[PDB]
Design a protein around this ligand. Structure first.
Ligand SMILES: [K+]
Ligand SMILES: [K+]
Ligand SMILES: [Mg+2]
Ligand SMILES: [Mg+2]
Ligand SMILES: [Mg+2]
Ligand SMILES: [Mg+2]
Ligand SMILES: [Mg+2]
Ligand SMILES: [Mg+2]
Ligand SMILES: [Mg+2]
Ligand SMILES: [Mg+2]
Ligand SMILES: [Mg+2]
Ligand SMILES: [Mg+2]
Ligand SMILES: [Mg+2]
Ligand SMILES: [Mg+2]
Ligand SMILES: [Mg+2]
Ligand SMILES: [Mg+2]
Ligand SMILES: [Mg+2]
Ligand SMILES: [Mg+2]
Ligand SMILES: [Mg+2]
Ligand SMILES: [Mg+2]
Ligand SMILES: [Mg+2]
Ligand SMILES: [Mg+2]
Length: 150
RNA sequence: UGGAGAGUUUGAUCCUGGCUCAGGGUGAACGCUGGCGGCGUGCCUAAGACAUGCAAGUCGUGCGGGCCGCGGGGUU
């Protein structure tokens, strides 16, 4: 019912009297490939707990994507921190052309053909957040004419 | 009908930032190896120096001759 894929898993370290102590963080995307996505970043002393916590947080933070024949309705451009994401719709038969993070996020959203570009900072966390905000700032023609009813 | 990034400054982080890699290309060369054919291509350097052969001539339907040879005439 819900597909789950991890973006990256890292081990951070805090200093304490005696040495360094490690804590694992993990990004996880969840999607039904029908138009709903979810991104989560979980931290835990061990890797499996971090993955499970990231899955929970991802399922808690969902985004409804307005797919239009497997692609996006309009080109977007989002700056999250120093990381820029550029999305652009593509005709079918093109495929998803993106970095690892945006490819995973868009594939779990149900996108089949899209053109992307990462600019500025290539940080996977910030790129993921920028892609999520990009999918969140998507508007359909129905939404546009709904905002201009008056 | 068109756009993917990654490694690397830190104990860990974010940023700035350079370096490097994955791609495509060549009138290429070098190493190891090397079976066939078709089509292309082959002094990028000394516009340095060149043996040798060929590469620009052709018209007797423009004209008069030389040399070699033959035939027929004027003459017993
Ligand atoms: K901003
Ligand atoms: K690192
Ligand atoms: Mg929406
Ligand atoms: Mg900025
Ligand atoms: Mg940069
Ligand atoms: Mg177009
Ligand atoms: Mg068109
Ligand atoms: Mg860099
Ligand atoms: Mg320093
Ligand atoms: Mg170090
Ligand atoms: Mg420090
Ligand atoms: Mg190359
Ligand atoms: Mg190459
Ligand atoms: Mg040989
Ligand atoms: Mg050879
Ligand atoms: Mg040949
Ligand atoms: Mg030849
Ligand atoms: Mg030359
Ligand atoms: Mg050249
Ligand atoms: Mg004439
Ligand atoms: Mg003569
Ligand atoms: Mg005679």
């Amino acid at each position: 019912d819900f597909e789950e894929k991890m973006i990256l898993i890292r081990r951070t370290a805090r200093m304490q009297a005696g040495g360094r102590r490690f804590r694992f963080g993990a990004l996880v995307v969840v999607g039904d490939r029908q138009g709903r996505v979810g991104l989560g970043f979980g931290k835990a002393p061990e890797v499996p707990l971090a993955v499970q916590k990231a899955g929970y947080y991802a399922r808690r933070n969902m985004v409804e994507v307005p797919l239009q024949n497997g692609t996006i309705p309009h080109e977007i451009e989002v700056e999250f921190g120093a990381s820029k994401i550029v999305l652009k719709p593509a005709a079918p038969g093109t495929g998803v052309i993106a970095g690892a993070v945006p490819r995973a996020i868009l594939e779990l959203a149900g996108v089949t053909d899209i053109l992307t570009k990462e600019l500025g900072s290539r940080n996977p966390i910030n790129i993921a957040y920028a892609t999520m905000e990009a999918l969140r700032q998507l508007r359909t023609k129905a939404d546009v004419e709904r905002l201009r009813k008056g």
